[PDB]
Structures are given as structure tokens and as C-alpha cells.
Symmetry: C3
Subunit: 268 residues, 3 copies
């Protein structure tokens, strides 16, 4: 919901509507139907129609939508689509650089916004962005930010620089009282070992999950985020409950126990 951990948010282009149910069947916590960078300019109207048809034909489906930003002439149409279909439970706003951009998207759609930091200018304004009314949680465009800062993506030095963006997302999350952020996409679909390392690092620094681009990435993300059997056995008992193994059942312990349950996908 607007406060649980999202372990995985899987992109699927609106140009491939047959892949939308496949994305939903992958077990990803959230599916993001993309109308933005994965859809060539000449196919945006067709893509929007494809998404409309999916939502009308599958009313129980729940998805996020990555819309075109305000500079694009289809921004209003994208927002209207988000506004008019109950199945759209939030939208990703790319290239976010101001609080105003967020508010416009949140009010026009009436839906929660996930600002995606993709530039240095967005990072510099993250304080105001994160504090904007309508923001659910933050994420960032790892590749896009690397390009904006002329980094050699994948290098240790680039990761050190991206660490600043990560720190900012984590700090602003806490300051603004947002839901757990998502780490950026790990693009090497064939490198399962590398994905696991990326997930471990994100988890260890307080991210709830990762943005992802192929159904095959879901299993390893979920596996790496999963707490131990012992932590879950304890967490479940603490959730129900009070003295549970010694400590009291206070907000810090429920927040702890309930965070374990959400990392295991046993929230709500």
C-alpha cells in the first residue's frame, strides 16, 4: 500500500500489452506499465490505447504507470489515463526536478506519485521533491543519473558517486516520512550473481527493494531480501502480540517485526 515495503517494481512497455499479464504473473510486488522511454515517440498514442484496453479488460489488475514528463505533449493524456482507471494505483514521474512537477502530477491524477530522480538538478532539489504532497516513495534512474554526471556505469568509482544519490534518497525518505525507497535498475539481466550483490547492498542500506526490467529478476530479488526462517518465526509471533522472548511489544519492535514480514512479502 502507501506504506509497505515494495520488494520489486517490474517495468513492462505499453507497446507489448501481452507482456503486462506476464509481468503480473512474475510475482513482482508492483508492475509498472511504461509509456515513457521504453516507447518510441511514434507509438505513444497506440501504447496509451493498449494500456486503456488492458485496464478495462482486467479491472482487478493493479499497476503503476510511468508517464511522460511535463515537457512531453502527452503528459496531460497520460495523467487523464491515471485519473480515470481505478486499476492505476500510482504513477512514476521521471526526470523530476521540482516540487511543482510532483504536485501537478499528483493533483491531476488524484493518485500517489513515485518521483524518479534522474539528474543532478533533481538530486539538488530532492528536499522539496520528497516533501511534496502526494509523494508515496522515491526511486532513481541509476543509468540516467550516471549519464548526467558522465560516470562510467558499473565501475566502483561510479557506484561511489551514485552512493550520494542513494544517501539522499534514504535521508529524504526519513525526513519526509515516506514509504521505503527502491534502488535503481540493475541492467545486466544475464548476471544473476551481480543482481544478488546489488540487492544485498540496497537492502543493507535501508532500501525496501529494486526497480527491475525482466521477470527473471524477481526471484533473485525476493530471495535476497527474504529474512531468515528464525527471524520470520519470531516476527510472526511478535506481530500477533507483551513479552515475546524478553523485549516488550512496543512501536520499535512492531516496526521491526513488521518490517521483517514485509521483506518476506507477508505484510498487510
Amino acid at each position: 500500500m502507501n506504506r509497505q515495503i515494495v520488494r520489486s517494481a517490474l517495468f513492462v512497455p505499453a507497446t507489448r500489452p501481452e507482456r503486462i499479464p506476464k509481468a503480473l504473473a512474475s510475482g513482482a510486488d508492483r508492475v509498472i506499465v511504461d509509456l515513457e522511454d521504453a516507447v518510441e515517440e511514434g507509438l505513444k498514442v497506440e501504447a496509451r490505447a493498449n494500456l486503456r484496453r488492458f485496464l478495462v479488460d482486467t479491472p482487478e489488475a493493479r499497476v503503476l504507470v510511468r508517464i511522460n514528463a511535463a515537457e512531453h505533449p502527452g503528459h496531460a493524456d497520460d495523467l487523464a489515463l491515471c485519473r480515470d482507471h481505478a486499476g492505476v494505483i500510482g504513477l512514476l514521474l521521471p526526470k523530476v526536478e521540482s516540487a511543482a512537477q510532483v504536485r501537478h502530477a499528483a493533483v491531476a491524477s488524484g493518485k500517489p506519485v513515485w518521483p524518479i530522480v534522474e539528474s543532478a538538478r533533481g538530486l539538488a532539489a530532492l528536499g522539496e521533491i520528497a516533501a511534496a504532497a502526494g509523494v508515496e516513495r522515491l526511486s532513481f534512474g541509476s543509468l540516467d543519473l550516471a549519464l548526467d554526471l558522465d560516470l562510467n556505469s558499473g565501475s566502483n568509482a561510479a557506484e561511489q558517486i551514485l552512493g550520494h544519490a542513494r544517501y539522499a534518497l534514504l535521508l529524504q525518505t526519513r525526513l519526509a516520512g515516506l514509504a521505503p525507497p527502491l534502488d535503481g535498475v540493475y541492467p545486466a539481466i544475464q548476471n544473476r550473481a551481480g543482481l544478488v550483490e546489488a540487492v544485498r547492498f540496497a537492502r543493507d542500506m535501508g532500501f525496501g527493494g529494486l526497480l527491475c526490467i525482466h521477470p527473471s529478476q524477481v526471484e533473485p530479488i525476493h530471495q535476497t531480501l527474504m529474512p531468515s526462517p528464525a527471524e520470520l518465526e519470531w516476527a510472526r509471533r511478535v506481530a500477533e502480540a507483551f513479552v515475546v522472548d524478553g523485549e516488550m511489544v512496543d512501536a520499535p519492535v512492531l516496526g521491526r517485526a513488521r518490517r521483517l514480514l514485509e521483506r518476506a512479502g507477508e505484510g498487510g
Copy 2:
């Protein structure tokens, strides 16, 4: 005093005043009597009484006091204890989240304040906190910060995040012209090798010392901060002569790190 290196600041819970003597004789640069985290809510009123009894009974003792946070009902009573006893030479303000909290504590106690940065809010306001009137030096609550940001304490990623926080504390120390800061408590009392690593890393990035939780940690901390014989020879000469401001200042820093401030 308000400018020297403090290599070690050892905590002793106010519920255990019988342990204060050992702390004061451990060689620790400062002893901190704690009224906060190490004292259960139900025993805070009592713990405050124990400290007050220790101060009156031991008028020569010199200690720091870690008071309860600003939003705690006992904050005023903690500040009154710090104000009324000459043996209290400063107070640690936990969970500092604004310059305004520092000012209230500084004016009410009339004693130097040591803000402990241990929350995101604290980091966000570190510029104004460090520059507030009454601040002696900053300290880092690494474990509390880790909890506040949901970090996996001890992991490589967590250490990267804590690096961002340490950088803020060190940069603001310099900008605000504060005395050398203290790095966080290393909790593994039975892991000397771990402690030594934590001290050397802290020292290498400009920290003056570490907060500590058991007398046995004082010796390894002091040993790891002790400058080499070479540094001390050179330092004692530059001191006797007192060569520009920064250079002479570094000579003193070496002498203080050797406990010859």
C-alpha cells in the same frame, strides 16, 4: 578543556553510581554519567537522585552528564541538575535535531553542550547545530543512526552510509571551529582487534577519540591514538618554541593525543 582532544569518554549508567569510581580511575579523558538510554524509563527519577547524591558526596569528581532528549518530560530536571552542580563540566544532548535545542540546553544549564548526532533530522540540521552557541564538540551515535535509517549495522553498505554522516560531522566541526569530535561507541567489548580498527579509522579521518562503554576499552583506545615516538619528539620541540598557526596547532594536537595537553 573546551578545546583539547578528548581521546575517550566513558559512559556509566546513573543507576549504577558504584561503578563511577572505577570509571574515573580508568584513565578515561572524560566520564559521562548517563540518564538516557542506559536507564529504564521507570528508573529515571531515581537515577537522577543517585547522580545528585554522588555529586554532593564526591565534590571533587568532574563528569559529563548525558541528559534525556528535548522532548522527554525529564529534560528540564536533567538540565537543573547540570546547572546546580559544579562537578558537571558539560552535558551530552542526545537526539539533537535543531540549533534551538542546543540553545535551550546551553542557556538553561550554563554548561558546555556536546550534541550527539544520531538521527536523519540531526544530519539535516547539522550546519545550524554545530554553529549554535554553547557547542563544545560533536559526537556520533552510529548505532542509533543505523536504527533510524534501517541500516544493516556492520555491513559494508551501512558503513558507506555512516561515512556520509561522519563526513558531515567532520566538515561542520571544521566550519564551526569546534573541538575534536568523538566517534561512536564500538560495542563488542570482547573484540579488541575490532576496537583498534575502529579507533585507527576514526583517528585517520580527524576524530579526536571514541565514546566507550566499559573501562577495559580505555587502554586500547589510548594506545591506538598515541602518536609515534618520532611525532612526539618533533611535537615537544615545536611546542617549546611556541611555525605558523596550523603547524603549531597540529603540534598541540599530537601532544593531546598523547595525553600531554
Copy 3:
């Protein structure tokens, strides 16, 4: 060029004017004649004259000049030297701490300014510094910053802190639209392996090049920055999107074209 990659900027002390021609033939992208730290206080006036005579005697020479900081009594004379010689194509301003220091140097010299961030104060005011009129690009004074922050130079902890400071230069470069910055001097002239690693790390985080202190450092810097065969192929084609043109140009400049 005021917006190209500078792969290497080689320091030569003004007390050694005879070494300037060697530095200018080393292949270094820029030569920096130093009037600051490499010159003892008692020789600064003599050194300034050495440079002036060198510039008068050698009009085709193109150099940067590292002047004395704003608070040094010779700051005005150093600036006048930069103003009066057409061969001075820019100046390095040490221990920059305000936009006002940059504007003073830029107006008094009429030349581009290269602020050197070497103090906590400079870091704190970097947004204003980077945005000041006359700034070409930023450079990092890692050894002087390590002194200002009481770091143990060369240690892991010190490099972690320095990394945080490097980020500020990289971020402000992008926000202020400056030319590619230069990373700090790698002091171990005899450790070629360590130099190569320092250059690779710098390049990977977005630095255009390194400040250097010996001509033997130039070749390894240029070789480490040299893109692969495929990267240039693509770069040469795109030469013969606006941000893509920027990346293509960056590649060619890293290859010395």
C-alpha cells in the same frame, strides 16, 4: 579551449623557468607555472620576475599561472602579471573560499579562473564559487584539504573523506555547467601503478584529468584516459542528439583529438 577536457595540467615552479620549455613539450595538455607553494616566501618576487621575463622572451608560450591566494601580499602583483601577458591563458586560484575571491581574480586578470578547492570553507561555499563569473573549471587540492581536516593522508579513512569532497566538485561542475574538472596531484612519482589506478578512478567518476607534478606522469595519464578502439569509432562517426554530441566530443578530447 575553455570547454574541452584537460587530461593533464603540469606544474612547474617559477623558480625553475628553464624547466617551462620541457613541460610545454611533454605533451601535457596544460602547463601551470607556479608562484605559490613551490616558491619559498623570500623568492616570490624574483620568481614573478622570472615568469614575466620568460613570457616576454617566449611570446608563443601558452601557460596557466598558479597565483598566491587572496590574502597573500603578492596577490595583486600576481594578478597584474596574468593581465599583462597574452600567453597567460588562465590562472589557478588557491584556497578559494568565496565567489568574491573568484570575481576579484577574474576581473583583475581578465583571464579565466580555475578555483582550487583546498579547505572546508571552500567546500561549503562551492555552489557560489562554481557559479561565479569567470570560472572555467574546478580542481582539487587533496593534500591541502587533508591538512585542513586533520586527515591521515594516504589512509583508507582519509580517501573516504576526500571522496566526499570530490563529489562536491563533480556535482557543482554539472550544476554550474563548467568544463571537466581535474583531480588532485598523485604525489608518488615512482609508483606508476598507483598513478594509473588514481587516473582510472578519477575518469570513472567524471573527472576530465589530473593535476601533475612531473613530466613522467603525463604519458601514463594520457594512456589510461585513452578510450578503447570501439568508443572512438563511434565518436568519429557521430562527429562527421545534443547530449550525445557532448559525450562523443568528450571521447575525442580524451584521445587528444
